[PDB]
Amino acid sequence: MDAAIRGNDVIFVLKTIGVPSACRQNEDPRFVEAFKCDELERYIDNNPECTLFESLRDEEAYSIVRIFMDVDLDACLDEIDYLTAIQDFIIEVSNCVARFAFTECGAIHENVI
């Protein structure tokens, strides 16, 4: 566990979709940029019209990321049913990820849960 493995407070963000990797590795100011939490906070406050797509600089050293998911349902739910669905969703997903980690990564199931 190194400093980059310890934590990574600097973030990297794109401005649109379909940016070629050549521009990204050429640190093209029109597409890629580097920020911190506070810097991006004032950026998004000052320029709401922009589109910001956060990602990694490279997969070689900063492979560590928080576990994240995107859910997209073509419907609308009332609040109480939404809460029930989110509770069932969170229990099932937490279980599934923990079990995968236990059976492959050799981690403690209960710690992950």
Residues in contact with other proteins by the rule CB under 8 A: 79-80, 83-84, 87
Q: What's the count of helices (H) and strands (E) in the chain, helices before strands?
A: 5, 3
Task: Report in angstroms how near the CB of residue 79 gets to other proteins at its nearest.
Answer: 5
Nearer CB in complex with other proteins: 82/100: 82
Structure tokens, 16: 């649109």
Report the nearest approach of other proteins to the CB of residue 92 (Å): 14
Name the residue nearer to other proteins (CB basis): 37 or 80: 80
Farthest CA pair distance, the chain: 49
